[PDB]
């Protein structure tokens, strides 16, 4: 397997290269929001981002070594975590706002446009604020996103061993970035833990987000794409 032999520098390079583009929303900013339009905007966006995510995953070292079935399981389990860490990361330098897209930057209060949404916004923002206070670096972020992809659905499965080997390499990569940044060994281990513990909160948000998305679908407040319904269906 070729991903096992990458150097730390070469893991970063690869992950940085594999990054998906920042998509725009369709939103016509000449008209104000309704509950239906906002949620339509969010789901239209997620649906387009999902297509890019699949491309990105295939470029995550080791992912392509897995069976198609395993690849599917991991993406089904992690897709909303991956979208959310993305959102948290681009909102990082906009305290109090969630940059869903460059032309869809929603302050905390616009979450009230959608029933049940503001609670999820509040969690998302709190995470963005955490990233900010830690001064999360882009190289660290891409490591974290790949960990989510590989880690989140792994225990719901030789296939397992390879994922854990690749996970180890990405841990090696994060520590390399921190060593490179001048941190002491003690600071390196403390920062590694801090970053990984955020993944617990990201899981929490995904799970909450999934039930909200499910509620918005049952209450029929917006039509969802076939792919998005399918990603939703995988959790229930």
């Amino acid at each position: 397997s070729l991903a096992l032999s990458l150097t730390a520098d070469q893991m970063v390079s690869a992950l940085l290269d594999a990054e998906p583009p920042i998509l725009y929303s369709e939103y016509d900013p000449t008209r104000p929001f309704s509950e239906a339009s906002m949620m339509g905007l969010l789901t239209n966006l997620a649906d387009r981002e999902l297509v890019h995510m699949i491309n990105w995953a295939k470029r995550v070292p080791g992912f392509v070594d897995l069976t198609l079935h395993d690849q599917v399981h991991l993406l089904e389990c992690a897709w909303l975590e991956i979208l959310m860490i993305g959102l948290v990361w681009r909102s990082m330098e906009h305290p109090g706002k969630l940059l869903f897209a460059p032309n869809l930057l929603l302050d905390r209060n616009q979450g009230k446009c959608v029933e049940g949404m503001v609670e999820i916004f509040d969690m998302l923002l709190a995470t963005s604020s955490r990233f900010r206070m830690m001064n999360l670096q882009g190289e660290e972020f891409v490591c974290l996103k790949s960990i989510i992809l590989l880690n989140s659905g792994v225990y719901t499965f030789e296939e397992k061993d390879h994922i854990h080997r690749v996970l180890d390499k990405i841990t090696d990569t994060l520590i390399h970035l921190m060593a490179k940044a001048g941190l002491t060994l003690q600071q390196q281990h403390q920062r590694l833990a801090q970053l990984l513990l955020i993944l617990s909160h990201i899981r929490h948000m995904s799970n909450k987000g999934m039930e909200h998305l499910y509620s918005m679908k049952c209450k029929n407040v917006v039509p969802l794409s076939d792919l998005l319904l399918e990603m939703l269906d995988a959790h229930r």
Partner: peptide, 11 residues
């Protein structure tokens, strides 16, 4: 049998 994710992955 024909999940969209399946066919998107195998491209």
């Amino acid at each position: 049998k024909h999940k969209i994710l399946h066919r998107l992955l195998q491209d």
